Symmetry: D2
Subunit: 318 residues, 4 copies
Amino acid sequence: DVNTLTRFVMEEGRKARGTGELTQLLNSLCTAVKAISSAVRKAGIAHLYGIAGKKLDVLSNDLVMNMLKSSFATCVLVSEEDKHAIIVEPEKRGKYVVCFDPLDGSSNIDCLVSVGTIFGIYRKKSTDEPSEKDALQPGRNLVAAGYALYGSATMLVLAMDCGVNCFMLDPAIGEFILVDKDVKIKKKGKIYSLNEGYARDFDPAVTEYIQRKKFPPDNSAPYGARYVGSMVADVHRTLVYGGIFLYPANKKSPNGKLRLLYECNPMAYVMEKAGGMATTGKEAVLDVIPTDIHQRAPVILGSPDDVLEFLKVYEKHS
Amino acid sequence: DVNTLTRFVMEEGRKARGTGELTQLLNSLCTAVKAISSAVRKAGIAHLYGIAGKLDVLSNDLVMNMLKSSFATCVLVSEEDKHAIIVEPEKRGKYVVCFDPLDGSSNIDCLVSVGTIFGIYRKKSTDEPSEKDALQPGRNLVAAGYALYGSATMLVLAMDCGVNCFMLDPAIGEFILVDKDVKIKKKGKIYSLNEGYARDFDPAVTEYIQRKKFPPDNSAPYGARYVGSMVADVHRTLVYGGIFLYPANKKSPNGKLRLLYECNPMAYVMEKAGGMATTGKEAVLDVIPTDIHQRAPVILGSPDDVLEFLKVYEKHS
Amino acid sequence: DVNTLTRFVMEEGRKARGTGELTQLLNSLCTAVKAISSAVRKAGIAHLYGIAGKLDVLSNDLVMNMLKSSFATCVLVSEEDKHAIIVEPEKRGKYVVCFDPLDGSSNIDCLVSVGTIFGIYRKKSTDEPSEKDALQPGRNLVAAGYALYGSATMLVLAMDCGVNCFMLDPAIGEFILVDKDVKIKKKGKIYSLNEGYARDFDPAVTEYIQRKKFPPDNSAPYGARYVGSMVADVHRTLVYGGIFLYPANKKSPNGKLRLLYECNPMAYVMEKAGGMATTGKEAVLDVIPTDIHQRAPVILGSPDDVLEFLKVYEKHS
Amino acid sequence: DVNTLTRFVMEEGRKARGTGELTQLLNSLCTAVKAISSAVRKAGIAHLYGIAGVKKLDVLSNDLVMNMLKSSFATCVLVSEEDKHAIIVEPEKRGKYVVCFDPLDGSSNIDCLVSVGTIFGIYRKKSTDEPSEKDALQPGRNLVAAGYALYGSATMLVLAMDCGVNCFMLDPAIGEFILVDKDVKIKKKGKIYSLNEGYARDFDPAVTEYIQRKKFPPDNSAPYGARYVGSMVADVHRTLVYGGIFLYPANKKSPNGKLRLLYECNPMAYVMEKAGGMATTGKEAVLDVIPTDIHQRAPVILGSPDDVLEFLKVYEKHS
Ligand SMILES: CNC(=O)Nc1cc(Br)cc(NC(=O)NS(=O)(=O)c2cc(C)c(CCOC)s2)n1
Ligand SMILES: CNC(=O)Nc1cc(Br)cc(NC(=O)NS(=O)(=O)c2cc(C)c(CCOC)s2)n1
Ligand SMILES: CNC(=O)Nc1cc(Br)cc(NC(=O)NS(=O)(=O)c2cc(C)c(CCOC)s2)n1
Ligand SMILES: CNC(=O)Nc1cc(Br)cc(NC(=O)NS(=O)(=O)c2cc(C)c(CCOC)s2)n1
């Protein structure tokens, strides 16, 4: 039986007997994602180049902000693009807090690299006036999370309590079609993924781990290397093929480079629901209690056996 | 003034005063590229999943069919076919085309950027057409390029007049000229190769990569990027500058990438953009092929970066 | 504030505190409409004509399949099917749906506007579902409307809260709310019917049309428009006002259009927009059907125009 | 073997051994038509209604055609329904053709989503003088090419040239015009008449009688059907496809009719005649009228030959 994102979400909403607010939010987000995908694929560019005589990340942010505000399902919105949390006007306020990166990887969009949208959804915990504090929850508290990848095609990956599900956008009809159900990552993979150009600044644990991938002590084949440089693409490949992705801490960056709330947490949630792992080195990404909405975190994620092996080496250097 | 691929090609055709065969070919190819892009972005997938109750193969069929019916080709070499395809007599024209209809497609399950690569030669011999007609050095290319199915779809076309980049506007199905007479940076800040085969590197590669990470002159280290799909890695190289390498290893002692329909078209694009492309021993475009699916090592990109690699290569004899 | 069809329906569903079944139904239907629109605008036709080497049937398949799998329906009546379709037990929900999947399609060769028409009823009893569950008067409609595949694609949805119009944005595949709580003009300036059958007209129709062309009170004559596709004619009538007629004659004492899935949905839309719809003898919505494909005469549009028609009808007894 | 508009045109251009200027013009026009179709089907309308949160459709349609034709290097004079005077192309962009067009016909009624279209006629510049409005005042007989795009249930381009009439469907998935009907010919006689009968009180008696005969046939054959979309491209296209007759005739109030000769009546008459149909003013072939003003009107009756001839019989009876 064919299924779409909207029908899938409604169906799980009815099972759970909820009030429908999350379904309204997810539908609204989905509409924004389709609009971002259209702009990313350059629909209407002929008009920009004078066939008849706004920047992408800004527009992407405007689309998500506007669709979420008008969903009546949110109260606090945190974006990569905004210095402070956005507090939704009273008459539009609902019970969810949303942290997102509207167009991740967009630094490099000039070369037409895969880009994506990342989101994490929390329930507001207190009855106080909404504020930035409502977004400072650990990833464990996520109600739903995921990403849209604008790649060779556009795919939405949604993780919730029921698992991880992948939906392909059919641009002929503008629907997200469920194509991979309850997806689970390989126990162990054959690809490692990080920027080795910064090898001079690596922590010795990272240096050793990568050494073992290239020059395996035992009699096994070396791992392959892939690094797109766009987190959604690298993480999605990791989910699909297995393996490991690293944006670790060093001396220069003791808290890593990626953002905890709207990059590391949603991806860690997806990984964990898919039976993978995600660590900072010292603890599970999802257990970090944030104190700042734009705070950074080291991240190492992927197949469980690979992450465990990394942890073993990390401890040897602790 | 706005310009499109078809109008641009017609305009250059008139200036050269040709008979129009190459324009018919390029137009045909462009149509196939649009059809590939549509299928790659998964238009109509709902029908596959039962709303009413294979990609590399289709891509090949599209290019084959559009080129055959262009009346402009005689020999077609494809990554997908073991032998060259000889066009039936009534449809024969004067060009030979070597292509990879969907490069990077082994990894399409993860929605990595894929692309279409093509090189176009004039039939050189007066013999009945055969596989031999495709065994020309890259120097003989009349036109070459690629379509990248990335965050958006772009067609990059290199000819004698230079390199030009066209964005597909999917709202109207037209390729809009957005970057004219493109030139690569003299020197870049990114290197691109699969370092997972480090154990098999020849010592020249090992040293060159060491210098990118640990620069002797105390400049900043280069960034690393490797998509694992050649069209994407090469296009980034064109756009941001830097260097791309796929050298020989134990598994692939003649390099891994295919000379006719991967290495040559990209080398031609690079050279027309003021870049370089080498096997280590010689320019990629100077290799005389003996087999249509033969492999070649390749190092390409910004001139200063490729020349630096060659310095190190020479040091190791 | 922007609004879409799905968000609009959900928000009215929550207000009404329903279980969500109607929302699942409407969302499913909306998906089928987008797929029909895509096929009607001929997406993928290049593949039909050999680039790599039925419409009414597909439209029906799309609606049938999307409604069955919505878990919200038990009985489906279609212009295309001689008997009602009874949904298999595990997929059965509480609603009955009558539809014409592609109205006007006999003339689709000339690219005339076509459309999809639908009416939705709540099931009558707790008995085993059967054809009988679809034989309700139009007054019982819970929701009704149409998609017009015209110069653009629009969905018109009528419910208790009124009539709302949504434009399909094909760039993103979303129905955008563009006209809220629409109301028809009290009186218009266009009449619409097939005057080629003038020899068979009831004398009341003859006289009414005469008065439109030769107005007794010295006002301007009405314009005439007749597309020959009911969704297009009715939508113009909603938007510009006026009157649409497919009346009874000697040859067709029950008219030509179908009551369940053409006349009733359009009458419901009209009435919710403050218009009227009559057979001549009674309101279309008051006819109690005895056969699912039964025909009905219909005269609909602006209230003043329909009332004037009725005056003349009464004069002829 | 599959064929597209651009390939078809290039192929006929090579056969004729021309310099390619007409091909550049037709390709440019085709690009504008695809841009019009996209806008007509409302691509990007969510942005108008505040999804993140300009130009009217006939104005944009005109801008698209003007701009694409000017930059084709193939035109010198452009006449548009939208512009009071002819546009003379700047010297560096001048080519040998004159183009008369209606960029979005039927657009007055676009609020109800009726079919709309683009109509065009292409002439060779005849004189060697500086280009001017005069270059557009040629009889339809001098047309080199003409046709129309119908933005209907789907988008179709109909192209008439010396080689005949050919119909191309736009595949919006790839943005190509696919040849679907070759060398099309109209039926000898049809069963549909098409005009606005709301203005029956102002009809010429010839028209009144002709229509009477369609509804109440003297020889007791079946009556004709009536269809009137109110958008000329849609009514004319149905006439081409199903056969029959289309009328926008002259009356006492409008002795020269209502439709425009250069960019409505002529291109449609040329298409009809290349398809083996007819097009008359009543007094003469539409293509034989020598224009004296670029926006001048003309009465028009066109379609299947037998139907037009029958209309002319009745017209002659009323002197
Ligand atoms: C009692 N409800 C009822 O009678 N009808 C009805 C109809 C529709 Br249509 C939708 C819903 N409910 C929701 O949508 N609930 S929810 O938004 O809170 C939700 C979404 C998801 C996805 C959940 C499951 C995931 O939980 C983590 S919980 N209910
Ligand atoms: C003598 N011609 C004439 O009278 N009219 C006319 C009109 C049109 Br429209 C096109 C053309 N000619 C061509 O298109 N020639 S071509 O196919 O061979 C070609 C294409 C490209 C791109 C070339 C340059 C590439 O090599 C450097 S060469 N000619
Ligand atoms: C108790 N519900 C709850 O807690 N949450 C919740 C969330 C969502 Br999301 C949707 C809904 N319910 C519906 O959609 N109900 S409905 O399908 O029957 C309906 C649709 C329309 C439009 C109606 C109006 C009747 O039209 C005549 S009634 N409920
Ligand atoms: C001598 N040419 C040559 O060597 N190569 C070459 C290549 C291409 Br590609 C195109 C063309 N020529 C044209 O396109 N000529 S045209 O613009 O005037 C024309 C178009 C149409 C459609 C015609 C038929 C018009 O009938 C009225 S005439 N030539």
